Amino acid sequence: GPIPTAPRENSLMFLSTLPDDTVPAYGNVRTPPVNYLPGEITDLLQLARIPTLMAFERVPDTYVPYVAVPTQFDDRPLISFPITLSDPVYQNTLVGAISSNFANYRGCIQITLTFCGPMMARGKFLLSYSPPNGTQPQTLSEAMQCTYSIWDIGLNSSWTFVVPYISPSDYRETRAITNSVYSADGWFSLHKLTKITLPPDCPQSPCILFFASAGEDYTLRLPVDCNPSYVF
Amino acid sequence: GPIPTAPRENSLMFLSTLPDDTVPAYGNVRTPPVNYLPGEITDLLQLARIPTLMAFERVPDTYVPYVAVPTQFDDRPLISFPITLSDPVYQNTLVGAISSNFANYRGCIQITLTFCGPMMARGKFLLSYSPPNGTQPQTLSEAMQCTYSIWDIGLNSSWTFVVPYISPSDYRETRAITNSVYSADGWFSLHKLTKITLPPDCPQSPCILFFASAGEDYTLRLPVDCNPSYVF
Amino acid sequence: RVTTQTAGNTAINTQSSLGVLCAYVEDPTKSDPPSSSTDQPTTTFTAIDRWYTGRLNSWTKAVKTFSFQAVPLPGAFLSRQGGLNGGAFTATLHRHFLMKCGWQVQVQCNLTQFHQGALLVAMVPETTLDVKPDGKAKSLQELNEEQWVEMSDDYRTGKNMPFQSLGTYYRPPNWTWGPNFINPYQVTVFPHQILNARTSTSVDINVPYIGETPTQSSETQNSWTLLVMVLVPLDYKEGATTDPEITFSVRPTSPYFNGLRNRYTAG
Amino acid sequence: STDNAETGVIEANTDTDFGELAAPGNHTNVKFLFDRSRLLNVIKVLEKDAVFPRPFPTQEGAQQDDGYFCLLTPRPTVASRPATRFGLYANPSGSGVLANTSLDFNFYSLACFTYFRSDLEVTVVSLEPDLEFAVGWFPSGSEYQASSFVYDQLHVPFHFTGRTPRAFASKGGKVSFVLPWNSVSSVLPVRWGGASKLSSATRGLPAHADWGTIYAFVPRPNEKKSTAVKHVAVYIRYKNARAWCPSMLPFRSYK
Amino acid sequence: STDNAETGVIEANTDTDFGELAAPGNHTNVKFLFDRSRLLNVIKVLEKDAVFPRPFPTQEGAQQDDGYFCLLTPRPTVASRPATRFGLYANPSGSGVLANT
Amino acid sequence: RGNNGNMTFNYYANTYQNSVDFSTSGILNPLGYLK
Amino acid sequence: RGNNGNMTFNYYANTYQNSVDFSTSGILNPLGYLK
Amino acid sequence: RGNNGNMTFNYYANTYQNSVDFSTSGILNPLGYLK
């Protein structure tokens, strides 16, 4: 006979993310095989792990992806930027674009550099990473105390700087609004330790290219909605 | 084919305390571990078993949590109060606050005292507990016949008095309205057996502190609604 | 009733003592490095493995019931309140971003048998009493004129803690409650000891590390607060003795540090 | 009996002095007590794309849409934002705008600890007869998407679609679902004493102590706006709750 | 560290320079990410037999029923037909017929 | 455990029903010890 | 696999639930090899 | 027992379906005995 039942309070509801299937309408259909197509993707982290280029405002569009070393300097890093993924410099990189669609991230960012200039030149650079503080460090003396390393021009013109992950919480927010300790994580800067020696007959002013990507232990947790602004 | 069914009379009902789960909407989410936090709670009786302080009207706010011994007395206990958990004296104690949110209780209340005064003083006190009667006992002669004990000032200045649980029903109501035998359970009183001898150069008038808590066999049964009066 | 605890190059003696209260868990000393960071941390060493000492205001008959004083930790080190000077510990603190440590304190008084009164000391967690209602920490000069904080209905209701002004757009509500009230009758819930005038002189507690994250910012954390309150007002025969004094000692345990940088500066 | 309560740790029925060891007869368990629904807040229902309130302080003459949206947290809130001092407008008619406020009376009546954690189970109930509506929610730290698009000369607000859950209920229906603990902080601080920013912060104001945000809207185009307002009710439940350290309880007046 | 990114294939945490190997804790999977509903288009409702739109270009004075029907594809579409350039009518009132997109 | 009555059948998987913490790889204790 | 919670019972047959291709009879590989 | 017909499946647990007393640890008898 009939089986007694009791419908719950949430009957006839429609959920846009309910983990369940639906009844088929036109089933029993075969499809051609696709074993001939190589390069199948499984996780977007595979694409996130690929280096890309950054942007910079340039002197007064002007968003060249490289920074040019001046001749005379004044006690100040050549270029510095925060470590907030919502910053403009991260807009077009794959890591920034992908992360913008998720709430929480976790892991180590990766930065890579490369030199472009005359072969027979020489110089030395210093890279720094300063955790959050009351004021952004400026002088080389301040910079030296924090974590840093020294880059020397030689046979190999590329160098990778790994930004350690330190925070009071296991995860961190991806976009910053109040600049709380949960989103901002300090600054990065580049300082010219020595003066670059341009060999004779090589005109002047070499250039540096910035390469950014995700570390080997990156991760994202919560999906969110997108911004359709690109259509306008 | 379709399975016959028959919805019951109470379909599409919403219950605020139905023991059942609900469909998930955003499942498959991990969380950081919390094994680093010590002192996890499991049952509120753990907090209920902790001593706290009482209140008293004081002579004509004035709600000091202690009672001062006078110089001359008149055939009357220094302080007495009922054993109804809705009484004002139990308001701010943890046991009273927790019990006020439940209907039925069961077990033995616990009372603890402590002396505060000059070291070289002496005296003797008598504690009494009188089950329900037609009139509250007043005189020491009456008090002596009922359950009682004698407290002597000495090296140890603290004493615990356990109120036995006797009632015609297994459980008892927590708040009294009609003062029926199901809620009220008699009175407690303190009598000065001797006269306190204040040593020379110690000024006068020692004080006594009251400590109350729940026994080892306390229990509460039925939850109820709360009073939001504290917000005004 | 006679024991001494030795640490580093300093020691403390106790002519009277009941023991040490171990707080929530047995052996609070045990701990592990955090998990919300990768850079190698800095651990304990002899320079910081030692005690420190400070002073409090005096106790006078004029003080009434339930008055109290508070000493935030580790903010006391930074503020140099009561003359406390962390030295090496302060120097290391100012040069780091993340910290995690326990605490272990003791308080002493010089009450004699010819005095009557009582004192209560407890380690209230996650409280804010140092800050003025305006929203600014109480300065050392301001802390002198008023020796003891006067209990009042405002503090009892938690109606005067720091808040954010809404602005001209809205209308000003009537503030009546907040989640940081103070309930004098229930302070004994936290670990504590009664400093009676006829039983002992020194009290001590041991507490572990707590917090809503495995590690907390080293420039703003206020997990534990030391609180001293008066239960029985002091009273004694005239001409005998006047206004005893108070002192306390602190010592961190199994700390960790992360996030090296230059000296902290504001602006 | 002999004891020393000044030491704090006191010993521990009638078998000790005069006994009675009444046999047991677990209704106070933390996991069991906190599993039951309770009202949280009452909110309006949208009929078009709205402008989220600006952060405080809000100057005079600022255009926005207030009264909608609502956080998911027991701690006091004001204008759909975290707050510390709870307040209410007991005074008669005044001026300016009145700020919606909320609080969990029942939760705070027994909130006798510091740290808490549990899963949240939300449901929604209508008030006006034969009303059709829908609900939307997003995690903590996210933002509400504004603006609208045109379909056949009808302005459809963007919030119709998104990666976050949506719920459509039949005419005169009800909604329900369970969300996961998603905030970055390991546990929820019932009472806090830290600061969230290095400078210009407010002491004791937590940053991301909540479960998310909720709003209600009608499945109609913006070209069919009406006049009469509508209202909606909200309830919450806790699953597998846990507490981590003792605390105090609210004070009761002696009047 | 030493590397040569001009070659393209670069090598691969803090254990390499200074480490930290934070343990894992798969929300980005292709199969999982794309399983959730999203609006596609809004269409009218028929009340009689209709005449399907003619293929482009459609000359002036051609009788048909437009605004109904809708393809099932993420790629841009116009007038219920496949298209390449996405467009919209942000301009004020004009003339002719407006093409659904 | 908890105010749950059903004890026969759980439809959805545990991972999709409740959150789970990721690995990093009667008798009531008293909240105060006095050495 | 996928955002599917049910793990107890599938009513309709697999062929009628999902398409099938007809026969013609963590660890993540890198998308670039450099000999 | 009682006016209950179902004899195949009880969904909710017995403790949540009926009250239970806590432990303190045809043939019809006549209501009157005459010694």
Author numbering:
A (entry chain B), B (entry chain B): 1 to 60, 67 to 238
C (entry chain C): 13 to 279
D (entry chain A): 1 to 12, 14 to 19, 21 to 27, 29 to 258
E (entry chain A): 1 to 12, 14 to 19, 21 to 27, 29 to 104
F (entry chain D), G (entry chain D), H (entry chain D): 14 to 38, 63 to 72
Passage from the reporting paper:
Seneca Valley virus (SVV) is an oncolytic picornavirus that selectively targets cancer cells by recognizing Tumor endothelial marker 8 (TEM8) as the host receptor. SVV has a typical picornavirus capsid with four capsid proteins; VP1, VP2, and VP3 are characterized by a single jelly roll fold, where eight beta-strands form a barrel-like structure that is distributed at the exterior of the virus, while VP4 is located on the interior of the capsid. The structural architecture consists of four capsid proteins forming a protomer, 5 protomers forming a pentamer, and 12 pentamers assembling into a pseudo T=3 capsid, approximately ~32 nm in diameter. We used cryo-electron microscopy to investigate SVV under acidic conditions and in complex with TEM8 at physiological pH, identifying multiple uncoating intermediates.
We also imaged SVV complexed with TEM8 under physiological conditions (pH 7 and 37°C). The A-particles obtained in both conditions are expanded by ~5% in diameter compared to the F-particle. This expansion results in reduced capsid protein contacts compared to the F-particle. Inter-pentamer contacts are reduced by 34% and 22% under acidic and physiological conditions, respectively. On the capsid exterior, the A-particle[P] had the following partially ordered regions: the VP1 HI loop (S229), VP1 BC loop (A65), VP1 Loop II (G97), and VP2 residues V59 and D67, while the A-particle[C] exhibited similar behavior showing partially ordered regions: VP1 HI loop (T230) and VP1 Loop II (P95-G97). At the interior, the A-particle[P] displayed partially ordered regions in the VP1 N-terminus (S1-S28), VP2 N-terminus (R13-G20), VP3 FG loop (G160-N162), and VP4 N-terminus (S38, G63-K72). Interestingly, under physiological conditions, no receptor density is observed on the A-particle[P]. In the SVV A-particle, its genome is reorganized and lacks defined capsid-RNA interactions with the inner capsid surface, likely contributing to the flexibility of the VP1 N-terminus, which is consequently poorly resolved.
